[PDB]
Amino acid sequence: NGLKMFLAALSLSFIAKTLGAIIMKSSIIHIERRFEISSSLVGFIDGSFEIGNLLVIVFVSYFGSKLHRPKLIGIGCFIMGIGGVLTALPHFFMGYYRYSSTLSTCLIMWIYVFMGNMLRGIGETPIVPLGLSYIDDFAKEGHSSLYLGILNAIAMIGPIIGFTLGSLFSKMYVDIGYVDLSTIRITPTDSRWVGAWWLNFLVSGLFSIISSIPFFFLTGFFQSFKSILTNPLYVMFVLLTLLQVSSYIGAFTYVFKYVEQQYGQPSSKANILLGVITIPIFASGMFLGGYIIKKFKLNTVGIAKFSCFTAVMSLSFYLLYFFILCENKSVAGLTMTYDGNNPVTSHRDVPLSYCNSDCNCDESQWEPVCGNNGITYISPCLAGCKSSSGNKKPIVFYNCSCLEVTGLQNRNYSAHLGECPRDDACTRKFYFFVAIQVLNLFFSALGGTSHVMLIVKIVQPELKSLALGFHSMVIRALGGILAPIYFGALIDTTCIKWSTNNCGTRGSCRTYNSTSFSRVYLGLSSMLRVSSLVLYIILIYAMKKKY
Ligand SMILES: *[C@@H]1O[C@H](CO)[C@@H](O[C@@H]2O[C@H](CO)[C@@H](O)[C@H](O)[C@H]2NC(C)=O)[C@H](O)[C@H]1NC(C)=O
Ligand SMILES: O=C1OC2(c3cc(Cl)c(O)cc3Oc3cc(O)c(Cl)cc32)c2ccccc21
Ligand SMILES: *[C@@H]1O[C@H](CO)[C@@H](O)[C@H](O)[C@H]1NC(C)=O
Secondary structure: OOHHHHHHHHHHHHHHHHHHHHHHHHOHHHHHHHHOOOHHHHHHHOOHHHHHHHHHHHHHHHHHHHOOHHHHHHHHHHHHHHHHHHOOHHHHHOOOOOOOOOOOOOOOOHHHHHHHHHHHHHHOOOHHHHHHHHHHHOOOOOHHHHHHHHHHHHOOHHHHHHHHHHHHHOOOEOOEOOEOOOOOOOOOOOOOOOEOOOHHHHHHHHHHHHOOOHHHOOOHHHHHHHHHHOOHHHHHHHHHHHHHHHHHHHHHHHHHHHHHHHOOOOOOOOOHHHHHHHHHHHHHHHHHHHHHHHHHOOOHHHHHHHHHHHHHHHHHHHOOHHHOOOOOOOEEOOOEOOOOOOEOOOOOOOOOOHHHOOOOOOOOOOOOEEOOOOOEEOOOOOOOOOOOOOOOOOOOEEOOOOOOOOOOOOOOOEEEOOOOOOOHHHHHHHHHHHHHHHHHHHHHHOOOOHHHHHHOOOOOOOOHHHHHHHHHHHHHHHOOOHHHHHHHHHHHHHEEEEEOOOOOOOOEEEEEOHHHHHHHHHHHHHHHHHHHHHHHHHHHHHHHHHO
16 A cells, blocks of 8 residues: 555646646747747747756666655656646737638748746656656555556547647637726638637646645666676667657658548548547557456566567458559649640649630649539639639639530539549458457557556666666657658658648648659558567567576
8 A cells, every 4th residue: 555655646646747748839830929929939849848858867777776766756747837837927928819712713938938848848857767667666666566457548538638638728718807808800610710728737736736635645877887888688679669669650641641641531531430439449448458468467577478469469450451452533734634635744834725724823723623524623714714603611612614515515514522532442442441440559558558568677677767767768769750850851752742842842732653652651551660670579589598
């Protein structure tokens, strides 16, 4: 009952940590819009949490391992809360928020946010290295796995509360309470709407300050650091762990864009409902993964073989994506001739057609256009439609120049806005995609406890915190910040139309060749998986040869 009490407090701190993370990302757009700030400065401010975290994660790990640990964790949580409160003072010190079509037919105080994010990042560092090593040092024969599984399962209450109230706070006017809301002309659907972003940080800061009260009642550096980097098993494990986590990060970063470009679901069918059933599977997988290791009495090689088996069984489900793909969308003008007559070889420098010769409009324009013929037009002017239907339900343009078709003359040449959806087969395949995805997520969550349970076992009983700290540092550096950058750089090789911004020729992409997208995305993930898997198998051979 002395470890049980310490066990409760750490759960509260885990919840607070996750809440703070998801809060920060949720409030970034409003801050950019309220503060009148550049995009480079936004990329900078968002990166502060990393400058504070990566700078002191190793020193707190080593030097804090011989002081009072429960008190260090409480001090860290208090610093995190104080930093969370500091991010909301600009609102109280600045002033009031002063600021308060295109159919086109044929045409012939930021330092405060920075230094608060830095304080938060500096403050969360003592939770994982000093908490888990404390749990491992004082525990019975096999209960460390079960405890870590319960901990990782309980922590999912942070994202729930965050997503719940960050969406409720983003539908209030920013100056709520000081102004009377009856004279406000702006609505959440406008372009200048800023919500109450300062209210997201008060609740998180006070929660982090509250969750730290129970904790208050419960020359060698260099050789200790060199004695850890000459241990082969540790280096091999860290490497593969890195490869696998990089693969996961990239996949979860671009799955939502892949699903939209491949199958056609508009980020609301595939987004909201999915998570509601995707999170309990993760929680149950984590808890059961811990419970199995506890119940079956596994040693080091047993844990290694169990996690290798889970990795294999989760990689065998990943290679089924290559077999449920659809055909490529057809947009007249992009890859085919503007009159549908013939195919082309270059996405660039397609010539204008007879049906569209007279109507001189901006090619750079990208407005969804689809006629009853089934194909796609870049713009209502590029299709030749010289009529409208008013601001009613999407205005059906009519009597189109390039919508005319043989045998279609005896019909209604009228194109609705919005791309014509895919056939039924593509939906039927989307359902198989979702099923396989939840299966792979379950089988990859069943083995997430083994990393900590192995790093602790393959290292001297006194260098447990330093090892976990260096592991966390390397992973959060080379697999959380680099991972999205290279995947994104690689993916952009498959664009066929760019949104030419005022200065930058590439503001964003309109469409992407779906076949090459799937090729690059799934190939990178599969190659990384094999990479990490290989290292682990060899590692198992070395382990079995050692003991
Ligand atoms: C297709 O465009 C032609 C030429 O603009 C339209 O021709 C006339 O449009 C007005 C109003 O409908 C009237 O002069 C006649 O009803 C149309 N016929 C002609 C040639 O005089 C035509 O209406 C358009 N497509 C439709 C709706 O039939
Ligand atoms: O970023 C994430 O990576 C994984 C993930 C994270 C950990 Cl620690 C783990 O132990 C397993 C794991 O499994 C997957 C598998 C995937 O196919 C994708 Cl596409 C993301 C994640 C994940 C699961 C649930 C929410 C977010 C993530
Ligand atoms: C389109 O089809 C329906 C029925 O014929 C009606 O809207 C009208 O007669 C046709 N012409 C257009 C473009 O509205």
